[PDB]
Design a protein around this nucleic acid. Structure first.
Lengths: 159, 71, 294, 142, 169
RNA sequence: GGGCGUGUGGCGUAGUCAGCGCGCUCCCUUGCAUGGGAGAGGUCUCCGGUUCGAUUCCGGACUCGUCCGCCA
RNA sequence: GGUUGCGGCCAUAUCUACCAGAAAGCACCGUUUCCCGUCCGAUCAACUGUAGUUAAGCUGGUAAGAGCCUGACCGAGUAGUGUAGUGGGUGACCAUACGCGAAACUCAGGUGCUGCAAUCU
RNA sequence: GAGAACAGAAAUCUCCAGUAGAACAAAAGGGUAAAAGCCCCCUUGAUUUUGAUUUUCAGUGUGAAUACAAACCAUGAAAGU
RNA sequence: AAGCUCGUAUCAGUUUUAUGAGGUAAAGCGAAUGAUUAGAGGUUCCGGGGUCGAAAUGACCUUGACCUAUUCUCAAACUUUAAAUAUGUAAGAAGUCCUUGUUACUUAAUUGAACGUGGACAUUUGAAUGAAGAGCUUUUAGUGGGCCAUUUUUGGUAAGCA
């Protein structure tokens, strides 16, 4: 018959990695999570308690509950034609903070600093990001850079 | 070439007979292998040949391959 | 030819942690010590780290951060001459005095010393520093004995007893103290008090000085050089205890020099690395030497 | 439980079955198709272990038949008196509840105990009734 | 050079394999106990072998470990039993050496008719000072190459002390 | 073609991850009848795996004996 | 800058073979009355810091060293791949257009950094 | 790998090398080295009370599991589990 | 189908930026597991066949193993490495910063946790593009035999086959 267990098809997903097996380092236990933090989920195969299901591997969610050794995380799961709210109790070995959130907060504080310093002059702050604009005019010189003519190479076996 | 051309009839599909630019069953070219074997940095094996490298311990590189260091 | 390791072995080998390779840290014990209840968010957990080397006892109060461990206060056994203890700097009572010193020092620098005076009149009874009402809780600290063996009579528990009588709230039971009867599950207080005041070394001093005098000159030579007899060590432990309860303030040494003054001599004495060009010159000379037909 | 179900096709020769609430041991099995379209029927010929009677039953192959639990146990004789054997278990337990065999097995066992061999007795349990089937002699540990 | 490179006997281990449990085992254990002055330890069988007749875990051998000058004294008695002649094959690559002897009568216990006759295996383990580095729990390390005991050093020590000669084979 | 069972000393076979009995060959004892004790005799069909260990647990292969292979 | 205690990252830190180590600190080291544990005070426990030693541990250096780490316009815009055609070819498969882009190999360099407290010519 | 009477291919003892090439009840795959393996000591948390959550999923049931709360316990020096 | 609450948004089968997760394609085997071709150098208290040897833990060849350095070819249920395409989250007003209130939680401790009071920051309010209105509810029909094409792919010699 068919087989769809709780950890089916999780072979390479829950292998550890090359040459970093063994016990886990103490930074994962010394990291501090608060309610509202945004965290990434990546399971550790060395810890069998508090494991996430294989669906939530690589998923990103929001902390809603902090307990003794675990963290409650909220994920949005697509079920059919809508998203449902899923609450997960995961031990802290299987989560880490999302770095995109802290990058955005750094942008927020630097952006507020720019607005605060330029408010003393009113110099059209222009605080929105802009994407890659087309590159403008330039003059390239041939002083020591005379062009070299290239041609297609004929065919050879090369074995 | 005639032996390979006779052997090609026993195979399905299309095969080509190409005269390689390499020396024997090695992977260097003919003048590259010639300018390598004029120095002592090649040394024969049962059918193949072992080559000298600039890496490794100098004691092993001198017990093997003596004629190149005999400069 | 026999003790040879392949390149495949050395490529697939995974090294342990550096402290495990040095054999100094039990990470299985460290994880259970330094981790915190996550609902106590940034609350530090404090370890009384007690380590026994030859000729020293090291007591520290240590919390853990990601960038490394942080020490509130440390107390070594080699600063006991300031309090009047000159000989036996690693005996069970020296461990007691070091624990008492680090307890009084931490409560002084935290300001929790006018309350929680600890056990002023010591008798060898088993009790913990209980919380006084309508005030702050006592300072809570946990042992880190490291790789040292737990054993009834070991002096890590003497350091524990000294720190507990100094006013720290350290959780412990009494079944590892000297004087614990195994069959009758109770603690004998007078033998523990004798050990606090050095009875086990003074009784040996008497029972070896009465018969074997060459041993009494080989060991306990410093006791004869400083005329310390068997009965006076009890009162010098008492005077050391009251000197600790007077001032644990930890004046450091004067260092006799500067950091760069030590660094000049040690930088002169240390060996340096060989650069790439002189390494190439060395191997060219070696090729011209042995492979140059002698 | 004392007894457990099984399928007729799952049964095979030298196995135990329950026929008419008797522990029986099969000697013959034969399957014949009922009709060309239909399923085959199993005809079972078996012998009761205790009484030796021959009992037969035919059933559908997919039908489930009852199967007993039969345990064979090894003991040493102590005495044969009044038709009741007295046996001795490993770890020194003793039972006298077993009745002596009544046939040529019982006669041979009685003569062997009279002339003084050390006799090893096999007694079987199935569905709450107890009997002795065979005896040997201990070649070593005399 | 040589401040504390001096070889010494780490231990002497005396092994008797009676091969089967019971009265012999107890008699061999009594012989080992009276010879050592210490109670001996019996060792269980790892696997069942029919040809030997052994099964798993019947304490088929008995052995004792003696350290110090007493071990040196029993080694003196064993060497005077062996007439201070040992094969070159007896020594090992690590530097440890052993020999096997028949009966304790040559050792001089004297004979009781009950206790029987049992031969012995003597094994001497040799080390230099500083061997605690491997044995201690904290900061366990490996011993350096120069300080290691070897076969040539142990045969030189066995020629110099005990004024004995080794056989060429 | 498919499925099931089958191989143990000459025979009957039994079995815990090779035993007896009757054969065989000797010896001993005592009829009316005997009986006892020794031996020679078994790659458990074969080959692997598993297991401390496999007759025993499994897989593959051989032999032999069975039972089906139907409606059009 | 050396050393110790507790660490963080967990080989640039490991492994092999040699060499060196002032001071201090670690270490080996001396002992079995007491607590305690062993067949064995070897490990563990306790005592002394006394009788000694850098021989080992430890630290550092060396090696056209093994390994590991970093980089390259080195291989290679190669292999692979998203999209397109009433493209080629009997087919197998393959070119082109708009895009993305490896691994092995080769070469060059490197061989622990650092936090808290104490202590040191 | 090198040794030690009987003792040899396999009995017990000693040393060295040994990233797991072993073991963890069973199928297979993950995980584990001062351990999750082997040995020893003490125990019954394989307990009570109802909730929440994950998988299968209709976000029903059943099975299995996760993290807590309120008790009462076990173990250890203790953190804890 | 009936609408209801609102009026340009608590949107989007899309892109960019930042940040995750994956073990396929490819590649690799002088890297682990497994398969596999060929010689070379060694090991015999440590193999087997011959010949010379009284025999010899004898010799000489040969052939097998094991080791060492090479060499040829591979893997759906092998792997150090590792794409492309797909895929999670974020790009603020429900935000940021400052100050200090509550608690029976928590801390050695106004230490922290959560929710707050008061104050400051507004149209470039925090990337692009588009918005066709956005959000919400009730009720009920039919359907629950499918098939084909490109690409990936399984069984099969194959099939207008499954």
């Amino acid at each position: 018959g068919k087989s769809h267990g709780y950890r089916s098809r999780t072979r390479y997903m829950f292998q550890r990695d090359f040459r970093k097996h063994g016990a886990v380092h103490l930074s994962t236990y010394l990291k501090v999570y608060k309610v509202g933090d945004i965290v990434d989920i990546k399971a550790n195969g060395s810890i069998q308690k508090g494991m996430p299901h294989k669906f939530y591997q690589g998923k990103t969610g929001v902390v809603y509950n902090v307990t003794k050794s675990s963290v409650g995380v909220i994920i949005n799961k697509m079920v059919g034609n809508r998203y449902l709210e899923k609450r997960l109790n995961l031990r802290v070995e299987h989560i880490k903070h999302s770095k995109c959130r802290q990058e955005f907060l750094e942008r927020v504080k630097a952006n507020a600093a720019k607005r605060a310093e330029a408010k003393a002059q009113g110099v059209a702050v222009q605080l929105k990001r802009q994407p890659a604009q087309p590159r403008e005019s330039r003059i390239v010189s041939t002083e020591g850079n005379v062009p070299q003519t290239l041609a297609p190479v004929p065919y050879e076996t090369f074995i | 070439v005639e032996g390979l051309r006779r052997a090609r009839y026993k195979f399905p599909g299309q095969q080509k007979i190409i005269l390689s630019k390499k020396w024997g069953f090695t992977n260097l070219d003919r003048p590259e292998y010639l300018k390598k074997r004029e120095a002592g940095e090649v040394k024969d094996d049962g059918a193949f040949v072992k080559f000298l490298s600039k890496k490794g311990s100098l004691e092993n590189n001198i017990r093997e391959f003596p004629e190149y260091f005999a400069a | 030819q026999k003790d040879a390791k392949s390149s495949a072995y050395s490529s697939r080998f995974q090294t342990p942690f550096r402290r495990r390779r040095e054999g100094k840290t039990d990470y299985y014990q460290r994880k259970r010590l330094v981790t915190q209840h996550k609902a106590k968010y940034n609350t530090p957990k404090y370890r009384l780290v007690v380590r026994f080397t030859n000729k020293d006892i090291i007591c520290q109060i240590i919390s853990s951060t990601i960038t490394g461990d942080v020490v509130l206060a440390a107390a070594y056994s080699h600063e006991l001459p300031r309090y009047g203890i000159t000989h036996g700097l690693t005996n069970w009572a020296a461990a007691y005095a070091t624990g008492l010193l680090i307890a009084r020092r931490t409560l002084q620098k935290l300001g929790l010393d006018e309350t929680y005076k600890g056990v002023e009149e010591v008798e060898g009874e088993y009790e913990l520093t209980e919380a006084v009402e309508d005030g702050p809780r006592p300072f809570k600290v946990f042992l880190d004995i490291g790789l040292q063996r737990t054993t009834t009579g070991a002096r890590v528990f003497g350091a524990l007893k000294g720190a507990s009588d100094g006013g720290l709230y350290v959780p412990h039971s009494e079944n590892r103290f000297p004087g614990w009867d195994f069959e009758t599950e109770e603690i004998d207080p007078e033998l523990l008090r004798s050990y606090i005041f050095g009875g086990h070394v003074s009784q040996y001093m008497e029972e070896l000085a009465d018969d074997d005098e060459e041993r009494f000159s080989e060991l306990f030579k410093g006791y004869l050089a400083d005329d310390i007899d068997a009965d006076s060590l009890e009162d010098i432990y008492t005077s050391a205890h009251e000197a600790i309860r007077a001032d644990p303030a930890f004046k450091p040494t004067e260092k006799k020099f500067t950091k760069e003054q030590y660094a000049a001599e040690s930088k002169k004495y240390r060996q340096t690395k060989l650069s790439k060009e002189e390494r190439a010159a060395r191997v060219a000379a070696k090729i011209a030497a042995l492979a140059g037909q002698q | 439980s004392a007894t457990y179900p099984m399928q007729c096709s799952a049964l095979r020769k030298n196995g135990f079955v329950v026929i008419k609430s008797r522990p029986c041991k099969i000697v013959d099995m034969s399957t014949s198709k009922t009709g060309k379209h239909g399923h085959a029927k199993v005809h079972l010929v078996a012998i009761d272990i205790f009484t030796g009677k021959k009992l037969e039953d035919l059933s559908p192959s997919t039908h489930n038949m009852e199967v007993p639990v039969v345990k064979r146990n090894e003991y040493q004789l102590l005495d044969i008196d009044d038709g009741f054997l007295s046996l001795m278990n490993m770890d020194g337990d003793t039972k006298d509840d077993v009745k002596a065999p009544e046939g040529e097995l019982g006669d041979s066992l009685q003569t062997a105990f009279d002339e003084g061999k050390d006799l090893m007795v096999t007694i079987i349990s199935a569905m709450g009734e107890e009997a002795a089937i065979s005896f040997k002699e201990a070649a070593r540990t005399d | 050079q040589n401040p504390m490179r001096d070889l010494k006997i780490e231990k002497l281990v005396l092994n008797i394999s009676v091969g089967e449990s019971g009265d012999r085992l107890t008699r061999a254990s009594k012989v080992l106990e009276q010879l050592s002055g210490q109670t001996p330890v019996q060792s269980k069988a790892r696997y069942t072998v029919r040809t030997f007749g052994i099964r798993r875990n019947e304490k088929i051998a008995v052995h004792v470990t003696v350290r110090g000058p007493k071990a040196e004294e029993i080694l003196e008695r064993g060497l005077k039993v062996k007439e201070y002649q040992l094969r070159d094959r007896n020594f090992s690559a690590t530097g440890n050496f052993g020999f096997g002897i028949d009966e304790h009568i040559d050792l001089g216990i004297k004979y009781d008719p009950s206790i029987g006759i049992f031969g012995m295996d003597f094994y001497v383990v040799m080390n230099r000072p500083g061997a605690r580095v491997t044995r201690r729990k904290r900061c366990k390390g490996t011993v350096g190459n120069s300080h290691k005991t070897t076969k040539e050093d142990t045969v030189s020590w066995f020629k110099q002390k005990y004024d004995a000669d080794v056989l060429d084979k």
